[PDB]
Amino acid sequence: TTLKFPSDWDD
Amino acid sequence: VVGGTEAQRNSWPSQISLQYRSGSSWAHTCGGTLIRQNWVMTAAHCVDRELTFRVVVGEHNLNQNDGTEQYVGVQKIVVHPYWNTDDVAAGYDIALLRLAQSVTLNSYVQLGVLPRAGTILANNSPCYITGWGLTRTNGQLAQTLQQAYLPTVDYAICSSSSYWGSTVKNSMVCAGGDGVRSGCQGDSGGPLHCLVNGQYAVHGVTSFVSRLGCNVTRKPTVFTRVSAYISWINNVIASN
């Protein structure tokens, strides 16, 4: 799981 | 960062907040490392899409005027040509952002020092992850920059079945995995600062954690190994 916020697949 | 403590304002001056336009404002989405007055190093998965980005240097509190920030647009993004959005575990999770203007350096804004190419740290090497990412798995972003001691886990251990197995590559650095401290959503792209010969240098670009959670015992946070891309980084900067 990558650590982009809110998610990798959901900014 | 899960299990972090608030960093002092001038401890990690190369840390930046990569934000994207959201509604009528800007929203923090990833971390990054300032490496040239006009280049920021971050994760490819953070800039893989079609979002509008701005970089904030000298940032401490995301929700308050610190009186030290400089805001600057991202004019060009260079993602590693081998980056595969469908397989972050394949590696190459790194991108360089050319800023619209050079920022001014001061105690809050400095270039992150990069390790020498090919450097691989001994197991249990001392490092710190920094970022505004979630403070708990499935939680919320930190308001102030956090830091957490995350010692490295060398490839031999990291790649064993009880840890990351086949998922980790030698082009990455694993750190932490103590069940308590870890990177979490919003820390991607940020630095893993490791103490080598008395100087902290940025050895990792925050990439991923376990599907099971941010702080999972024996699932250390995984970072792109900066030292594997020194030639790539220098070639990009030299040509843009």
B49 with B69, same domain: the answer is yes
Q: Does B89 touch chain A (CB under 8 A)?
A: no
In this structure, the strands spanning B221-225 and B5-6 are unpaired
B141 with B204, same domain: the answer is yes
Distance CA(B231)–CA(B166), nearest Å, equals 26
Number of domains present in the structure of chain B: 2
Return left, alpha or beta for B224; rule: phi > 0 is left, psi -120 to 50 is alpha, else beta. Answer: beta
B107 with B73, same domain: the answer is yes
B104 with B141, same domain: the answer is no
Q: Render B33-45 in DSSP notation, one character per residue.
A: EEEETTEEEE-HH
B75 with B124, same domain: the answer is no
SS3 B167: helix
What resolution in angstroms, rounded to 1 decimal? 1.9
CATH of the domain at B27: 2.40.10.10
B147 with B233, same domain: the answer is no
Phi, psi of B129 (to 5 degrees): -95, 140
Distance from the Cα of B169 to chain A's closest Cα (Å) equals 15
Give the domain range for residue B132: 1-12+112-227
B34 with B99, same domain: the answer is yes
B18 with B56, same domain: the answer is yes
Q: Which residues of B touch A10 (CB under 8 A)?
A: none
**Token pair in block for residue B179:** 């069940």
B78 with B2, same domain: the answer is no
Using CB atoms within 10 A of its CB, is residue A1 exposed (0-12), middle (13-18) or buried (19+)?
middle
Q: Which residues of A touch B46 (CB under 8 A)?
A: 4
With b meaning 16 or more CB within 10 Å and e meaning fewer, what string describes B218-228?
Answer: bbbbbbbbbbb
